[PDB]
Design an enzyme around this catalytic site. Structure first.
Site, PDB file in Angstrom:
ATOM      1  N   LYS A   1       0.869  -1.186   0.000  1.00  0.00           N
ATOM      2  CA  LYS A   1       0.000   0.000   0.000  1.00  0.00           C
ATOM      3  C   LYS A   1       0.903   1.232   0.000  1.00  0.00           C
ATOM      4  CE  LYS A   1      -3.562   0.662  -0.283  1.00  0.00           C
ATOM      5  NZ  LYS A   1      -5.037   0.393  -0.307  1.00  0.00           N
TER       6      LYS A   1
ATOM      7  N   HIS B   1     -10.608  -7.186  -4.054  1.00  0.00           N
ATOM      8  CA  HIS B   1     -10.241  -6.088  -3.182  1.00  0.00           C
ATOM      9  C   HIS B   1     -10.792  -6.398  -1.824  1.00  0.00           C
ATOM     10  CE1 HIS B   1     -11.604  -2.233  -1.234  1.00  0.00           C
ATOM     11  NE2 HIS B   1     -10.360  -1.847  -1.582  1.00  0.00           N
TER      12      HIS B   1
END
Lengths: 424, 428
Positions: free
Chosen positions: B198, B325
């Site tokens: 991330k 996701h």
């Protein structure tokens, strides 16, 4: 333990033949016998499921090959069954002799073979849950499915056989009288005329005569790509405000796209968009406003329902395509349409032309004001009439026809005839 | 065996059945979350979820799990109260009931709202349908095409702990050594065979250095990077080119379909999104502009498992690959995601999960969900394969009642420490 988990014990494949009238189309004339293949999947615990598909020899041989490789597979394992069919079909591509459902391909061949099994497996899953197939598809969104009166030009009967009760239809008066007969018996609230038989101006006059005779009923005309772009556009404009849609006036995505931009009503197709590989071109080129889906070649009820969602996302409406078929297919079509919000136009059916011939027990399928109520029983809601199945299988053995060949049949009378493709 | 109940006399054949919803219980929960950094700020000390339990007249129950934000929770409570009396197979009809409750018109489109409110009920209804057929949910979706579902190690830059509270076991990660050590910890415990980082937190040069350090430390493993739209088009093209051969895909580097499409034409790896294509009305633009090669699908906002399966088919038809996701979630969502992935041939890439960050916190009984070699075996039981742990649910509901958090706000939390911070979007 093992033999109590809904695994397939065996699959029975029975080709059948039944009487068909001399209906005319762009590819010729219907032969006196129509062929289908009946599939019965039986689980270890004895639950059976029925499917129905094309009767053509090349297809029938693939259905038999696949059936022989299903024992031991789970009826819920539809992906795994699809994979097995694809393995069996391999490199082979099955083509028909008429082209009335568009071009052949590998994926289309696999979907056509898979569809019979998938319907049967869904019939079984419905029975196991005590629910109609429609409930496996998200539940019915309508209680009954409307069907159209499917009108054809036709001979009085086949050579050296008895004339049928329908009579000949070779001009607007005959088409109108045929409509009164069908609507009177079935209650249809929509009408479709199969064209590409007579010059377009004559078929346009049949459409006009229908509109006069049946005010307020939606009308569709389907010449099966028998016309040129120029003619299509002319007829399209002459029929302004009269047709709900114009189905496959001319060959190919490009030609259809040119016709669509120049006529006032939407175009429909079951010829140039007939497998998922064609969808991106349909989105890009806009040959159509309406896709005619048919679970027999799109690969069963679930795949058809996925295609419906895709169509709705890209702003394409749905109706349902039909070939001569029996009650198992009518039950399947009816469950699918009942559970699919995007199928909003009346569906096609050949049912009236089969004159009550069928392999299922009576009382499950009925027409009420032009619509078929979703059947009552768990699964498809139809059961096999084994005596009728035996009679039809014997008809197949004796009938002398192994593959549908409308053009070949017409050519036996007129040797210079060829399937009309961008001809008028 | 039905034991004479619900069947034709002397047989095992069910007659036509009805199975109506008796009541729907909705319970907000909160659990502990570490200070993971992202383009929007920093995760707050509590993550919120809503647990839904649908109970039939027959006594069969099904579970679903969705977002815990307050406005959403309020809609979920309102829908839950209007669902009794509907059949659990009647999913079209339930979807329409939910649409009525949220003031949508499905016959501007409020489809995004309907889909996210409907999702938790759909998952619970499929759990029930599975239990009724004595089959796992994957079987309602076509059958599993793999025995176990691979997930990626989802790595984050992070603080050692939340200011003024005990530090967590993972440690801080503020540079490449820290990110590698975090990866070693995660992969050692769960066995992940793919890694996602991330990004959007540090200048892109530092994040590319962390990616290179991971590739060095973990030679065989696919790597993905997700800046969450924190970069400009220009920066995305420079980074994407510099990371040629190294990333599996680059997820959401820049904001909007237009920007993404400009980046996608100039970088060597496919782009993925979970931000600019999030509902069916975005799909025609995605097909036309080609902002992406990979769609990250999430059943929590695409409208449940069946709808997600329909989207997977559309994607395949148009040449778009799929992955999945996730946001901070618990075991009910993990089970649902796993069934979906197991039964969806088009879902080829490892799925994401935040599971390791929850440090064992869960509301389902232990034993059903395990990671073996980076993958979750599809649960055995009928239905989702998980059972509510009612004591744990009570503890997490009391945590929700007592925490000062009602809607997720990573930017607001970050601003409580640095008021000049704003969410990075098209920033680097």
């Amino acid at each position: 333990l093992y033999f109590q988990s809904m695994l397939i014990r065996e699959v029975r494949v029975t080709p059948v033949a039944f009487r068909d009238p001399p209906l005319l189309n762009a590819a010729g004339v219907h032969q006196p016998w129509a062929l289908r293949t009946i599939v019965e999947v039986v689980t270890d615990e004895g639950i059976t499921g029925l499917g129905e598909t094309y009767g053509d020899l090349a297809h029938l041989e693939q259905v038999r090959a696949a059936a022989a490789r299903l024992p031991g597979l789970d009826v819920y394992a539809l992906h795994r069954i699809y994979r097995r069919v694809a393995d069996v079909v391999g490199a082979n591509i099955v083509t028909d002799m008429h082209g009335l459902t568009g071009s052949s391909s590998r994926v289309k061949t696999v979907d056509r073979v898979f569809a019979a099994f998938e319907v049967a497996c869904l019939d079984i899953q419905g029975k196991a849950a005590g629910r109609p197939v429609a409930d496996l598809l998200g539940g019915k969104v309508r209680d009954a499915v409307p069907y159209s009166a499917y009108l054809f030009y036709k001979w009085a009967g086949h050579p050296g056989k008895p004339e049928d009760r329908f009579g000949p239809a070779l001009d607007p008066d005959g088409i109108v009288a045929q409509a009164r007969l069908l609507i009177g018996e079935y209650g249809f609230r929509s009408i479709k005329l199969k064209g590409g038989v007579f010059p377009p101006e004559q078929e346009a006059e049949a459409i006009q005569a229908l509109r006069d005779a049946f005010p307020g009923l939606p009308l569709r005309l389907d010449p099966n790509a028998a016309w040129t772009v120029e003619t299509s556009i002319r007829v399209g404009r002459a029929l302004d405000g009269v047709l709900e849609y114009l189905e496959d006036p001319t060959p190919g995505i490009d030609g259809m796209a040119r016709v669509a931009a120049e006529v006032p009503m939407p175009l429909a197709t079951n010829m140039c968009v007939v497998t998922p590989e064609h969808l991106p071109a349909a989105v890009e080129r806009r040959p159509i406003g309406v896709l005619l889906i048919d679970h027999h070649y799109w690969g069963g009820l679930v795949r058809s329902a996925h295609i419906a969602t895709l169509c709705a996302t890209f702003g394409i409406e749905l109706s349902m395509h039909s070939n001569s078929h029996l009650g198992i297919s009518l039950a399947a079509m009816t469950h699918l349409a009942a559970a699919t919000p995007a199928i909003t136009h009346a569906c096609d059916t050949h049912t009236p032309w089969q004159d009550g011939q069928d392999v299922v027990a009576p009382g499950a399928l009925r027409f009420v004001d032009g619509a078929v109520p979703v059947p009552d029983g768990p699964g498809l809601g139809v059961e096999l009439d084994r005596d009728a199945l035996a009679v039809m299988h014997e008809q197949y053995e004796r009938c002398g026809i192994r593959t549908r060949d409308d053009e070949g049949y017409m050519r036996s009378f007129d040797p210079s005839f060829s399937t009309r493709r961008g001809f008028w």
